[PDB]
Amino acid sequence: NRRDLRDPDRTVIASELVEHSFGVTLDKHVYAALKFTDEQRTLDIRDYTKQVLMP
Amino acid sequence: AYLWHRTAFILAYRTPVVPEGAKAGASFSANGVALRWLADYDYSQLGDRTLLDV
């Protein structure tokens, strides 16, 4: 604050120290699910890496 | 009795590929063909299920 010098009203105004805060929350679950019948895994799926995992 | 030339009848066999999501099981043999053996524990029924197929 400020006050004029040599003022008869010698009164002081106190400041305040307030600490704020927020919150980070972990609340979403991102997934990708696949199902393959054993016939598809045996015959149809040629290579598991380049045809299933990469996509 | 049956008298057949070689090319009369055709047989084809394929051993299923055990997927990565199953506990590894041995591969067996029957008359020259290979068979996939696969075990899985059923928690709901408190049992163990085995499958041997081709």
**CA–CA gap between residue A19 and residue B14 (Å, rounded):** 70
CA–CA min distance B48, chain A (Å): 19
Chain A: which residues have CB within 8 Å of chain B? 36, 38-39, 41-43, 48
Nearest CA to A45 out of B35, B26, B17 is that of B17
Residues of A in contact with B16 (CB under 8 A): 38-39, 41-42
Question: Six-digit token pair at B5?
Answer: 């030339």
Q: Could you tell me how far CA A39 lies from the centroid of its own chain?
A: 42
Q: Could you tell me how far CA A42 lies from the centroid of its own chain?
A: 41
A41 and B14 in contact by Cβ < 8 A?
A: no
**CA–CA gap between residue A51 and residue A47 (Å, rounded):** 6
**Most distant CA atoms of chain A, gap in Å:** 98
Q: Locate tokens 């019948």: which residue?
A: A37
Q: Does B12 touch chain A (CB under 8 A)?
A: no
CA–CA min distance A23, chain B (Å): 39
**CA–CA gap between residue A44 and residue A18 (Å, rounded):** 65
Q: What is the resolution of this structure in A?
A: 3.4
Question: Six-digit token pair at B11?
Answer: 């047989």
CA–CA min distance A53, chain B (Å): 12
**CA–CA gap between residue B10 and residue A37 (Å, rounded):** 27
Chain B: residue nearest A34 by CA? Answer: B21
Evaluate whether B37 touches B51 at the Cβ level (below 8 Å).
Answer: yes
